[model samples]
Target: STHFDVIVVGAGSMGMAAGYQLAKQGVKTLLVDAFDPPHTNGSHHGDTKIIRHAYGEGREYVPLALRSQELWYELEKETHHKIFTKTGVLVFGPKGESAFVAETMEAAKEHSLTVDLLEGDEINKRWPGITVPENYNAIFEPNSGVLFSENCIRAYRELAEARGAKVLTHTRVEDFDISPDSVKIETANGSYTADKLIVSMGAWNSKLLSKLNLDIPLQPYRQVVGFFESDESKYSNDIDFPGFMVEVPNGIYYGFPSFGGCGLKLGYHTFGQKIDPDTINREFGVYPEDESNLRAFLEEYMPGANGELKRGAVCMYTKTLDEHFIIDLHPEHSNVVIAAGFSGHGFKFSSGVGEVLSQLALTGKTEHDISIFSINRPALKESLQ
Candidate 1:
């Protein structure tokens, strides 16, 4: 039996980072993935993802965001790769009607983060590329910016392998067995055993957890992002231009400025259609709504960047009923830990989550306050009942 201290399944974002954390501590670890990481098959494929310190999702996420940013900086220095780009972030919406915007303000105040409130006119004057609605209020976080997601995953993967973590890519798991003391899983290549297991399979989490008789409200949604032609002078991906999120009547939309002539990338942040990850239509334009929805939002808020659809790509967001993350021990198996249902805003916290998962799998507890992401929370339980 090839036994290891811990085995991490689905080495994408969190799992890969967790593998690195464990290996860095000299723990014998293995990371298995359906496909090689930094691939287009998962959520971490997109070239860039915004990382806002004053999170609008909830104030509870502020600590994780701050810690993750620090870890990202460390990764950049350690790996000698340009990981984070400081382009700032702007979130705006109807003055009194958008809870997302309001929550962002409260989170900034509670964390003492540097978030500046800007009126509609001020936002337009500073960034001529944007045309904020007359009734909208905006908050600008000068410190937070964007992360090259694929690069982060690759950096972690490389460091993990260099640190002695065994990796299995392009191998699909076939079965799982949890005995009284150890956990075992069968894959196409062979079988492996471990004292503890950490399951961080993003889109495939629901299916894999079901085999263990642990089911939560994790659903995968088919999401899309597109790059559109724009004026480089106005929307260049530089410090002068910031990543943006706007709450429109249709839905919340987000995107980045033009990155070295790649055009402005835009995506809808609302409920994408529920889907089965195995059979998702990976083609970007299979449905018109994918491009139109983003295009419509851009035409309304950022007319300068809505010229031509240079290209588009499809991805998945594994969501929970409450849209909060689920990071806890399996209800019946103390030796197993689950980290999924990141909803959509998870990549930014991968660094923090990696450390947390490692702590829980090894020490049975984590230093960070993860009570809110409990799998047995009311939102998840109510859905089960």
Candidate 2:
């Protein structure tokens, strides 16, 4: 049997961040995952994830998002990798109903962020490829951008390993027995004991915590990401274009600059098929409807880049009902910290979450104002009940 100070399950985005922090703090930490780091099996496999400090979802997340941006830059400097690109983020929608554009502007104003509200014609003059209704408004956030998800995970894993942390890949945790002082984790290879355990298992959190009789309302939604072929000279140039989000009548769609490689990557954010992680189908070339849906949207909004479908893939989002993250200790087990329910927006918070999780594991609480993300919130509990 092996022993450590803290054991982290799921060495994905947040887990790796926590593991890196724990090891940096000189804590004997073990990071375990069913697959290798930056694997396609998890939510972090997408080429890029958007990071916007002026969060439109809620004003409460503005502080956390701001801190997360700082940490992301720090990670880039520490890892010596160009992980993030500031292409700016534009959110445009209707006026009143689910006014994403207005909400984002409000959040940016509250955070004192530099933002510009543009009309549809002004947006068209700047980027003529997009077609927005005349009545629509747009909120331009200059500080928002995209992060290389796989690269960030790889950097974190490398840093954690270099800092004397053990990363166990292709090792599944079969079960765990929790006690007051320590928890014994039973893996496919062997068993280990730790003073504390972090369950950051993403979509698998529901099943993993079920063994501990902790009922958390988590939905694993399968989202489709696609890249379409575009003009290399006109559309693929990064200097001319940036990442953007469009709130069409159907739903919200997001995309990045072509990056001179695989065309522009785009995906619908607000809608996805509910799925179980274990049962998620990994078939890539089977979803024609998904491709068609994106192509149709691109033709109308971004017509210049809608030539052909280059490639596409599927990813999962472990979402809570309120679409907020749940990062707190288990109600019954003080030694266990749960950091799941990223709800598709967690990648931007990876670095700070790692710090928060490390703090929670070491001190049983975090200095960050994460009251909105409390695991035992009344609404969350009532939803489960």
Candidate 3:
């Protein structure tokens, strides 16, 4: 078996980021993935993911989000690829129903970040594409923007490989042997051993951990992304429009500005289909009903830019029960670290998480404040059984 310093399973967003950090530190690292890099078979396939500094999920995440934004810029400098676009982010909801909006504003205030709160006609006047209900308010985060998902992963993979990390695409981990000293991973072609193991396996996490008789409540959901075509001349990037998330009566919806390939990509955040990763539909097309609903929403709020159907695609979200992440070492195995259950909002923190995973693999602890995401928290322990 081949021996290395570290082994990272499921080389997607978090895995690739962690592997890149480990490799950069001159550690011999092996990154194994079931699919090829920059492929749409995983959660990081979409063209873009929004990164908001003023986190609405919780105040504990604001610091990490800010750090992640810095790391994103650093990655761009290191890879020389445009991965982040500063198009701002708009969040709107009813006064009482917009929990995330309110919390985001609060976090911004605590962090002293630049943010604006708009009410009444001011919101519509500034962002003509969106229509706000009379009883609602909106918050605009100028520092928030979108990250090119596929491009970011590709850049990391390239840089990691350049730094002496072995990236094994199309290789699945058949099994693993873990002890205090090292981990032996069995793959389709051969076996390898590493001093440490980081399991950032996304939705396939439960399957691997089950062999050790330790389980976490990580659910995988099938999320649909809808894209609609628009008048290319009228809705070009020159409009200076930004991405947005709205708290509708039924659920929360997020969308990006026109990016050429697709006019606009929209999806529901709080709702999706519960699915197993092994059986997810990996296709890009639109169903009649899906197109109709998307058009209806656009026509009612963004009538000026609505047009033909562009396309639709499916992605996956690995969620935890409380919607927090699980970033801790395996309870029974000292050399194994668990980095799963991002719960849809993990992309923005990939850089910081990679650093944390690196520290955990090297020193068994991280310097960042991640107490809220502790795997051994009391509630999580209760939920596990």
Candidate 4:
């Protein structure tokens, strides 16, 4: 009988980190994944993910954001991997009319983190690469920056493996049989059982959870990210240029400085086409809007860095109705934990999320207050009806 203390069904960002935490506690752990970690198939692939402490989304996320930063640095020290780069993060929107920018300032004030507010023109004068409209207002968090996303996952995977966790990559979970005592997971390659189970398969969470007659409003969307040629001196991470998020009348855009001459990386986070995880198109240029939208945004805000489309890639975002994360245990089975619906801005909290998931699996509770992400929330409940 192949058995373990805990078996994580998805070894992407959160799963890999959970495996590391479980193994660190000397628990028998198994990590199973559909594809290899740090791969281009999931949301964790893009070279960089912005980590903002004074979160624009909500103040409830500040605790996890702070904890994840510590874990990221801890991962760096343990694996000797270049995990985080302190390039700072600039978040700006339409002058006083932007509620997102206001929420960010409020969150910062509530948490006592240093967030400097600046006028759009002042931002342009300081960075030189940015050209926001004079009517815009911005908040700068010098402590927040970029995370080498793939490297962070790799670091967790390596440390987890070193700590005696077994990993099964390139394997998919076909179904799961849950009982009071244990969960028997049927994979494409083999079968395994564990005392507890974690279902954190990102975009594919809906399909996996449906097998157990458990349902929530998790939707997958096809998102595109591009790297454009730029003036290295003006937008390089080596300089003072920081990662940024700009909200215009059209849409919300986020980007990273050209690190290692990879060009300026940017993406549109407002919305994307709803997609099926199994059959979604993975090609970059499948739709012209993919490149054009990104280019047009650059033409308006950061023309100096918008030279040419160096490369483009497609990934998926698993979103919930209210665009918040879903991290809770199965309503019926306490031993089965579910972590999904990260929406778009989930990578930065993967470290803290994995820790929370581990705590849930072991003790059925977490020290952090995650009641806002409950599965029975109004957003999810209304979606079901």
Give me candidate 2's TM-score against the actual structure: 0.96
Off by over 4 Å in 2: 382-385
Q: What does candidate 2's lDDT look like per residue over 1-385, in tens digits? A: 6689999999999999999999999999999999998899889986898998777778888878888899888888998766898888878877675566667888888878998878868887776567777877888888789899999999998998999999998998978899999988888788989999998988888677777667878889888888888766545546567678768888888898788578888998888888889998866556666777788788887888897778788999888778888998888888999898889889988988999999999999889998988888876762232
Name the lDDT value of residue 350 in candidate 3: 94
TM-score of every candidate relative to the true structure: 0.98, 0.96, 0.95, 0.98
Clashing residue pair totals per candidate (backbone < 3 A): 0, 0, 0, 0
The residue ranges of model 3 lying beyond 4 angstroms of the native Cα positions read 231-235, 284-289, 381-385
Off by over 4 Å in 1: 382-385
For residues 177-224, write the lDDT of model 1, one tens digit per residue. 998799998998999999999998889986778777875778899999
Q: TM-score for model 4?
A: 0.98
The 10-residue segment with the lowest total lDDT in model 4: 376-385
**On a 0 to 100 scale, what is the lDDT of residue 183 in model 2?**
89
Error of 1 at 284 (Å): 0.8
